[PDB]
Design a protein around this nucleic acid. Structure first.
Ligand SMILES: [Zn+2]
Ligand SMILES: [Zn+2]
Lengths: 69, 114, 89, 438, 101, 57, 286, 64, 49
RNA sequence: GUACUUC
């Protein structure tokens, strides 16, 4: 659902490189290897932490009972 | 007058039948509706069934069968039918034409890939 | 055995020891003599031509040859004929 | 090297496609359920339930009033009734009509309830006139992604606007605010003789063998009845029927030569006849026909055979009184013996039934290995929605049974004026129950 | 052995009938045959002192099937295609008209 | 439990205060016993740990 | 009935089955198997059958295993010679896969059976009514998509992968041999590198997880629910995880596994979790 | 015709009863009376043979 | 072994292979009480049984 | 009462 900040095993500040990672995939054409490492992620657990996220919050936000449609 | 159909029989044809004691016998085959009953002029007769006809579609095979059914012979018009009997009248080898479409086979060049 | 009120069982079993002078080539003789053989197991085929003309029946019962049925199932005419005349009929 | 999707996944998370949704395999996963309940509306003849009430039979009853030996013979006029049309169209509600939503349906803690319209073809005196009438029979519960719910041809983006799932699956009922699913049912092969060797036939069969072969016909509306054939050590062979809670043993002859005219060598000719060498055919066939002539020597043609069938089975299906043995006999017959051939199927019905019993002789002669009631050789799968339609067809006739019982109950207490009045049709139509939805 | 065809027609007059196996063919009474003209459908009936003929021609599926017949001698060795409408029949009797009220 | 069939119940919640640490810095959050493979034979977890190691390395 | 049979190959999954009493009772359908839910109105199956050379039903007058009884669904048309059944057994295959035949539906059941070994009554079966099951399969001659049912694979042999295919003793090939697995089994990576007692033991686990039921929470009124928040998609996965949109429903997560007996608090059936992981919300759900 | 131990009739299309269970040299049909029989049917003979299926033994296994 | 039997016209049709098969599986050449088959097995631990 | 699940 939400971006898991402060990875349980590593502990790095990881809840900030999400939108930066998305921008690297949007208008930079860099692949997963050199871009995810360029963010500043060097340990194994922090590599899989950001890479595995599913960001299901977009599906959890398409239903608002306080707004017409 | 059962049933209430269209029209009773009025036209007949005479069959030249001698009844020889080598012997003039009947010839019946089986064929579908989409056939060449009018545009075909030749048909090869052979031994135990192994043959093939050659027309536009070109997939046929004349089958034979050894092993009943009575056939009426209209000797004249007023009765339009008789009973075929020599001593009724049996048969020997009924014909049934089939359509053996040649199945394209054995291409073991693209399915067997390293 | 424990609870079903043990009675005549599907496959009854009994073990019989033997002396030291008897041999295996003599034990099989008692095996064939004691082993009960069905009367129907000495027939090749059962062909019968039922006639009518007053019902009439004829029964022709093919058997094996002497070396087959008499050497395999140790029976002969003095027992096979007595059972086919006193029990089968 | 199957790299996962992040840009495509982010795009489909931002907005679903306005066109046909992606990954259609998930939509095809419920093709059995969606296609099953949707089959009763599409196709010819209005679907399953429409052709079912088409081939449902017409039932009549008399009254206690005279007209004016033959005068006293006629005991009363004829009133006719039969279910002509049945149709579910669309769920709606009111205080014009307004449209309901499934999300609001389970939020209301109720079931998704539409409405069912019934069209009655009321007749009198063999069609002298018809009192047309249409009455609703409550609401019919419908699942999602069906022909009744509005989620059939709705875009997935509009599904998000309707408080639904972006990839909604559907195909499951909802009742009393909780969801619910109909379990798929397992049956055996349809329209195929099944060989079975089971000692259970010896329990209910007094001195009968363990052989057996069965046939499960199927009507066009998928309702069926099981017709099996046993084996008799004496030499004969008998069917068994299946009614409410009753079994009917019957010899093969009195129902084989009773459909139409077949009493000739066509029976023995239908038997294997390439060679007359083996006599296992002769002893069984002669003993079978001898077992038919020894019982009733005055039964030779299908007419009198059908008279005896209608006579013994006159008061079993409640077909009375004007339906004589020649009507009730053919009626119960075509409904009891391999109904899958349908009406006018007597042209080759003897050929299919003879092939069934001849496979029994081939099963007892010892050249056909028995099948298995649990193997996938004869594994059929009722998708649940078809069973739901069969329950509808079955539990609709109870209204017909209740209105004919209401008429024959009102005729007991008298004071039943002629039924040619519309207000009399109404006063007799309100006494019968009409809530099928519950 | 290729062979040619000589005789063709447009209206049939011959018929093959299937009653059962082993018909002694008494041949003592002429039975009538009613025709039609869909296409390729015929019927026939007859009457006797204990027998009545009743035969139809595959009313279910006959319009998509046709049989022919011919003849050949050792000198001729050729056949003549003649339309033979096949017919299945069932010998009927009269033991009707009995019913219980 | 995983997708390979092996199951397990949480015995006692224990922090990184005494668990074996790696030379890199990562702390193993969950620990499974190697004494189940002789009988349960869940080597799928072995081949998928190497595959998962490369799939995340 | 509890035990399975090899005839269930590719029809019902031999892997998805619970433990205990429901063993062998309930086992859902295959992966890509189809179910014909309507009768295709053909009215031409006999129109091409007896035209191919099949004798009619009213003028055959035979029986026994020496003749192949061709059986349409419900209706019969007659029996022919066994050699005719052999040629028709492959002729109907070619005309079925060929698209120029308007009178032959793709979802047509066709079966052939030899008469030897005292098998059941031979013939030529034809079906396709309701309650009928299908599954995809590839036909080698003029390679094209095809489907079979519960009677085809009984007699005629199939090839699972284009490496065991050999000459003139095969008729059909399978595209991906994992289509026999279920949704849980095919999603399980390297299901071939485990045991069947582990596949039945895990079938209940995957079918008892605590994943996301669907994004309808604020508009659902069912009795009880469960929801996680650390839903992560597995790194290793099959192409069906994406083909089924399973990414839309995250059910678990990924953690580092350390195979080691250092804990001592576990013996071949227990587990231990990091307190720091629980502080981050290791499998935190409500 | 005549097949096995039973003779059929064509004038009414059915089969007749046993000439021994009823009076001899004169038998009738079941639905209509006809001039019958000619009292020259046949000498009735028929053959039955066991298919050798339910006869298991050790020598039946060695003959294979 | 061939034997011929006669019978009157009271019964018309009977089963031959069945009524003979029953008696074929009911006649016993020699009746040894409560035993039908014996086997000479292999001696276990030198104890011939 | 009917169905479902835990070793
Ligand atoms: Zn980390
Ligand atoms: Zn007669």
């Amino acid at each position: 659902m939400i971006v898991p900040v402060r990875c349980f095993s590593c502990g790095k500040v990881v809840g900030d490189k999400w939108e930066s990672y998305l921008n690297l995939l949007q208008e930079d054409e860099l692949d997963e290897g050199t871009a995810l490492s360029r963010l500043g992620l060097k340990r194994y657990c922090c590599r899989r932490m950001i890479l595995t996220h599913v960001d299901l919050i977009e599906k959890f936000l398409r239903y608002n009972p306080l707004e017409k449609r | 007058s059962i049933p209430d159909g269209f029209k009773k029989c009025k036209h007949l044809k005479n069959f030249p039948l001698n009844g020889d004691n080598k012997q003039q016998q009947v010839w019946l085959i089986k064929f579908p509706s989409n056939v060449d009953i009018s545009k075909l002029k030749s048909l090869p007769v052979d031994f135990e069934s192994s043959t093939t006809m050659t027309i536009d579609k070109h997939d046929y095979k004349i089958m034979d069968d050894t092993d009943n059914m009575t056939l009426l012979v209209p000797s004249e018009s007023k009765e339009s039918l008789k009973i075929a009997s020599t001593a009724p009248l049996q048969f020997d080898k009924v014909f049934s034409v089939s359509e053996t479409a040649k199945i394209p086979a054995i291409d073991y060049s693209k399915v067997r890939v390293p | 055995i424990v609870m079903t009120a043990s009675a005549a069982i599907k496959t009854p079993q009994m073990t019989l020891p033997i002396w030291n002078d008897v041999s295996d080539e003599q034990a099989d003789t008692f095996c064939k003599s004691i082993s009960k053989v069905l009367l129907s197991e000495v027939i090749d085929k059962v062909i019968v031509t039922e006639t009518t003309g007053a019902r009439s029946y004829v029964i022709h019962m093919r058997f094996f040859d002497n070396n087959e049925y008499s050497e395999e199932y140790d029976v002969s005419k003095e027992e096979l004929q007595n059972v086919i005349s006193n029990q089968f009929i | 090297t199957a790299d996962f999707r992040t840009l495509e996944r982010e795009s489909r998370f931002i907005n679903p496609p306005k066109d046909k949704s992606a990954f259609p395999l998930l939509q095809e996963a419920v093709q059995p359920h969606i296609g099953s309940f949707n089959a009763l509306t599409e196709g010819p003849d209005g679907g399953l339930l429409n052709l079912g009430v088409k081939d449902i039979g017409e039932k009549v009853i008399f009254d206690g009033k005279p007209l004016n030996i033959s005068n006293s013979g006629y005991l009363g006029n004829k009133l006719s009734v039969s279910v002509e049309q049945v149709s579910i169209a669309k769920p709606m509600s009111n205080d014009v009509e307004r449209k309901v939503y499934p999300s609001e349906s389970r939020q209301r803690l109720t079931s998704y309830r539409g409405k069912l319209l019934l069209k009655l073809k009321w007749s009198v005196n063999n069609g002298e006139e018809n009192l047309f009438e249409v009455r609703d029979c409550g609401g019919l519960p419908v699942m999602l992604q069906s022909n009744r719910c509005h989620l059939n041809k709705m875009s997935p983006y509009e599904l998000v606007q309707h408080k639904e799932e972006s990839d909604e699956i559907g195909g499951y009922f909802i009742v009393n605010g909780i969801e619910k699913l109909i379990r798929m049912l397992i049956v055996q092969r349809r329209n195929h003789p099944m060989a079975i060797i089971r000692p259970s036939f010896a329990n209910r069969g007094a001195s009968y063998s363990h052989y057996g072969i069965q046939i499960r016909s199927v009507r066009p509306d998928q309702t069926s009845q099981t017709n099996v054939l046993h084996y008799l050590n004496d030499g004969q062979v008998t069917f068994r029927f299946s009614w409410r809670k009753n079994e009917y043993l019957v010899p093969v002859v009195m129902i084989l030569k009773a459909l139409c005219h077949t009493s000739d060598r066509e029976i023995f000719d239908g038997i294997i006849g390439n060679d007359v060498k083996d006599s296992f055919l002769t002893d069984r066939l002669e003993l079978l026909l001898r077992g038919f002539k020894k019982r009733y020597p005055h039964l030779q043609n299908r007419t009198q055979v059908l008279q005896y069938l209608g006579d013994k089975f006159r008061v079993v299906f409640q077909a009375s009184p004007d339906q004589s043995d020649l009507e009730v006999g053919q009626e119960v017959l075509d409904r009891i013996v391999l109904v899958h051939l349908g009406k006018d199927g007597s042209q080759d019905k003897f050929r299919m039934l003879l092939f069934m019993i001849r496979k029994l002789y081939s099963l007892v002669a010892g050249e056909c290995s028995p099948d298995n009631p649990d193997a996938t050789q004869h594994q059929e799968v009722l998708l649940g929605g078809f069973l739901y339609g069969m329950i509808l067809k079955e539990k609709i006739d109870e209204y017909l049974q209740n209105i004919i019982a209401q008429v024959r109950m009102d005729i007991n207490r008298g004071m039943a004026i002629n039924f040619k009045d519309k207000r009399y049709m109404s006063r007799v139509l309100m006494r019968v129950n009409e809530n099928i939805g519950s | 052995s290729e062979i040619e065809i000589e005789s063709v027609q447009d209206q049939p007059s011959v018929a093959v009938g299937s009653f059962f196996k082993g018909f002694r063919a008494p041949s003592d009474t002429t039975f009538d045959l009613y025709k039609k003209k869909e296409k390729d459908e015929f019927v026939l009936h007859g009457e006797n002192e204990r027998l009545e003929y009743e035969g139809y021609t595959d009313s279910s599926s006959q319009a998509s099937n046709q049989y022919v017949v011919g003849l050949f001698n050792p000198e001729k060795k050729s056949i003549q295609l003649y339309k033979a409408p096949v017919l299945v029949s069932k010998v009927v009797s009269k033991s009707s008209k009995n019913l219980r009220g | 439990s995983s997708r390979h069939g092996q199951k397990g119940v949480c015995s006692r919640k224990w922090p990184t205060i005494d668990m074996p640490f790696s030379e890199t810095g990562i702390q193993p959050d969950i620990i499974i016993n190697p004494h189940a493979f002789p009988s349960r034979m869940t080597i799928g977890m072995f081949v998928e740990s190497l595959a998962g190691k490369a799939g995340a390395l | 009935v509890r035990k399975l049979l090899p005839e269930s190959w590719g029809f019902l999954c031999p892997v998805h089955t619970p433990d205990g009493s429901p063993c062998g009772l309930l086992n859902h359908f295959a992966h890509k198997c189809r179910i014909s839910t309507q009768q295709s109105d053909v009215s031409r199956i006999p129109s091409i059958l007896y035209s191919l050379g099949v004798a009619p039903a009213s003028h055959t007058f035979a029986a026994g295993p020496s003749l192949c009884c061709v059986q349409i669904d419900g209706k019969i048309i007659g029996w022919v010679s066994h050699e005719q059944g052999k040629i028709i057994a492959d002729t109907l295959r070619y005309w079925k896969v060929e698209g120029k035949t308007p009178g032959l539906p793709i979802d047509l059941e066709i079966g052939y059976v030899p008469p030897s070994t005292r098998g059941q009554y031979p013939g030529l079966y034809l079906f396709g009514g309701h309650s009928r099951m299908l599954r995809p399969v590839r036909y080698l001659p003029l390679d094209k998509e095809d489907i079979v049912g519960p009677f085809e694979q009984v007699y005629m042999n199939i090839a699972v992968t284009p490496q065991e295919i050999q000459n003139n003793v095969h008729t059909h090939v399978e595209f991906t041999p994992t289509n026999i697995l279920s949704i849980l089994a095919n999603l399980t990576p390297f299901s071939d590198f485990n045991q069947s007692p582990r596949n039945m033991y895990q079938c209940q686990m995957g079918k008892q997880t605590m994943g996301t039921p669907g994004v309808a929470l604020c508009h659902r009124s069912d009795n009880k629910l469960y929801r996680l928040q650390t839903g992560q998609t597995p790194i290793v996965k099959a192409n069906l995880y994406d083909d089924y949109g399973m990414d839309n429903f995250p059910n678990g997560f990924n953690a580092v596994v350390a195979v080691i007996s250092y804990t001592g608090y576990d013996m071949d059936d227990a587990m231990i979790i990091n307190k720091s992981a629980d502080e981050r919300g290791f499998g935190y759900g409500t | 015709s005549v097949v096995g131990s039973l003779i059929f009739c064509l004038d009414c299309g059915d089969l007749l009863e046993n000439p021994n269970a009823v009076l001899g040299s004169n038998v009738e049909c079941s639905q209509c009376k006809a001039i019958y029989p000619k009292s020259q049917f046949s000498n009735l003979k028929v053959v039955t043979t066991t298919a050798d299926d339910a006869f298991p033994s050790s020598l039946r296994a060695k003959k294979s | 072994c061939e034997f011929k039997l006669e019978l009157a016209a009271d019964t018309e049709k009977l089963l031959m292979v069945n009524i003979v098969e029953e008696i074929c599986r009911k006649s016993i050449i020699r009746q040894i009480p409560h035993i039908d088959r014996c086997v000479h097995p292999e001696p276990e631990n030198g104890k011939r049984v």
